[PDB]
Design an enzyme around this catalytic site. Structure first.
Site, short mmCIF file in Angstrom:
data_model
loop_
_atom_site.label_atom_id
_atom_site.label_comp_id
_atom_site.label_asym_id
_atom_site.label_seq_id
_atom_site.Cartn_x
_atom_site.Cartn_y
_atom_site.Cartn_z
N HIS A 61 1.26 -1.13 0.09
CA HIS A 61 0.10 0.26 0.39
C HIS A 61 0.50 1.42 -0.17
O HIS A 61 0.89 1.98 -0.29
CB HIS A 61 -1.59 -0.06 1.26
CG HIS A 61 -0.53 -0.96 2.21
ND1 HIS A 61 -0.34 0.68 3.84
CD2 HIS A 61 -0.69 -1.59 3.32
CE1 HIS A 61 -0.04 -0.11 4.37
NE2 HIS A 61 -0.14 -1.59 4.51
N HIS A 91 6.05 6.88 6.37
CA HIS A 91 6.23 6.34 5.03
C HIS A 91 4.75 7.86 4.66
O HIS A 91 5.31 8.89 5.46
CB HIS A 91 5.07 5.62 4.89
CG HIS A 91 3.33 5.28 5.57
ND1 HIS A 91 3.62 5.07 7.04
CD2 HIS A 91 3.16 5.89 5.36
CE1 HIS A 91 2.66 5.98 7.29
NE2 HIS A 91 2.17 6.04 6.69
N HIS A 93 2.29 8.69 1.38
CA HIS A 93 0.36 9.40 0.31
C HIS A 93 1.29 10.19 0.01
O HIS A 93 1.14 11.35 -0.44
CB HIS A 93 -0.11 9.24 1.26
CG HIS A 93 -1.02 8.77 2.70
ND1 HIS A 93 -1.15 6.94 3.16
CD2 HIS A 93 0.44 8.98 4.01
CE1 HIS A 93 -1.19 6.89 4.08
NE2 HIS A 93 -0.99 8.13 5.17
N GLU A 103 -3.61 13.44 2.72
CA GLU A 103 -4.86 12.92 3.36
C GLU A 103 -5.47 14.44 4.11
O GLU A 103 -6.35 14.05 4.48
CB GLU A 103 -4.19 11.87 4.50
CG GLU A 103 -3.54 10.57 3.77
CD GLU A 103 -3.90 9.37 4.46
OE1 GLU A 103 -3.24 9.47 5.67
OE2 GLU A 103 -4.06 8.19 4.13
N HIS A 116 4.22 10.30 6.42
CA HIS A 116 3.73 10.29 8.94
C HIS A 116 4.92 10.09 8.46
O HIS A 116 5.36 9.02 8.95
CB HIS A 116 2.77 9.30 8.40
CG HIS A 116 1.57 9.88 7.58
ND1 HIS A 116 0.09 9.13 7.13
CD2 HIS A 116 1.02 11.05 7.76
CE1 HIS A 116 -0.68 9.80 6.91
NE2 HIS A 116 -0.60 11.47 7.24
N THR A 195 -4.83 5.64 9.75
CA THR A 195 -5.52 6.15 8.37
C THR A 195 -5.57 5.14 7.00
O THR A 195 -6.14 5.23 6.42
CB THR A 195 -5.33 7.19 7.45
OG1 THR A 195 -3.99 7.43 7.10
CG2 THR A 195 -4.88 8.50 8.39
CU LIG Z 1 -0.32 7.39 6.79
#
Ligand SMILES: [Cu+2]
Ligand SMILES: [Cu+2]
Length: 257
Positions: A61, A91, A93, A103, A116, A195
């Site tokens: 992911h 990581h 997003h 996010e 994050h 999340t």
């Molecule tokens: Cu995250």
């Protein structure tokens, strides 16, 4: 059973993870005008001098850069936090286009990506125990905008070819996460959740006001990753973000005026 596709994306997660419709879900929109300055917050203490990065992993992911969290080496303290929180991984997003990927949003603005840095509260002994607590985690969130290159990101970008597909990992020692921070540590904070599934309501979110800049080329390399495993149909790892969730009975506090 979950991901970011049409058939298994955020809007489906509640079926297996009913907490998706809970009282303190993340991310949220940060309404800058309605956040309130909290003069009693402290300055954040980011203490990353002794950080020990170990590995980078494509988990299907995102990719995680993992740290040795068996001692207080890279810790977050202060701000809204009570006690010491150890860095376990970071990581990102990101989007398929530069106009989406974050996010959190700021007055409904979406950034190109969001970093994050995930930390757990040492009073709970390990990560897996910490996620079961309301104050178990502290996630430092940093927006990415496309412009100039971020020099401290380059070592991450250049290993991505070696972890193209789900389940691949590579050694990633001696990486300094300080090189991913913006100049200012001004922030917003609120109580929220993971999340991704299992969406546990265990996070004190600390979202920095000042984005970092990364180059087109750097974000383009993120977009070459794959959600799939090697030898499976290629599906680019893009748009691996959950949209903003209802704020419900929460107030977002600002560390700055
Ligand atoms: Cu995250
Ligand atoms: Cu699954």
């Amino acid at each position: 059973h979950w991901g970011y596709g049409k058939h298994n994306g955020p809007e489906h997660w509640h079926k297996d993870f009913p907490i998706a419709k809970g009282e303190r879900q993340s991310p949220v929109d940060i309404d800058t005008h309605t956040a309130k300055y909290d003069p009693s917050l402290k300055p954040l203490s980011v203490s990353y001098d002794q950080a020990t990065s170990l590995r980078i992993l494509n988990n299907g992911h995102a990719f995680n850069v993992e740290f040795d969290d068996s001692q207080d080496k890279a810790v977050l303290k202060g701000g809204p936090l009570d006690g010491t929180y150890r860095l376990i991984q970071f990581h990102f997003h990101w989007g398929s286009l530069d106009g989406q990927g974050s996010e959190h949003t700021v007055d409904k603005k979406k950034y190109a990506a969001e970093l994050h840095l995930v930390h757990w509260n040492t009073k709970y002994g390990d990560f897996g125990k910490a996620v079961q607590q309301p104050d178990g985690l502290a996630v430092l969130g940093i927006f990415l905008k496309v412009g100039s290159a971020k020099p401290g990101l380059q070592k991450v970008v250049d290993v991505l070819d070696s972890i193209k597909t789900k389940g691949k990992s590579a050694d990633f020692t001696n990486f300094d996460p300080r090189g991913l921070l913006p100049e200012s540590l001004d922030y917003w904070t609120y109580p929220g959740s993971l999340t991704t599934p299992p969406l546990l309501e265990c996070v004190t979110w600390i979202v920095l006001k000042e984005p970092i800049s990364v180059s087109s080329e750097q974000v383009l390399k993120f977009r070459k990753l794959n959600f799939n495993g090697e030898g499976e149909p290629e599906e680019l790892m893009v748009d691996n973000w959950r949209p903003a969730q209802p704020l419900k009975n929460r107030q977002i506090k600002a560390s700055f005026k």
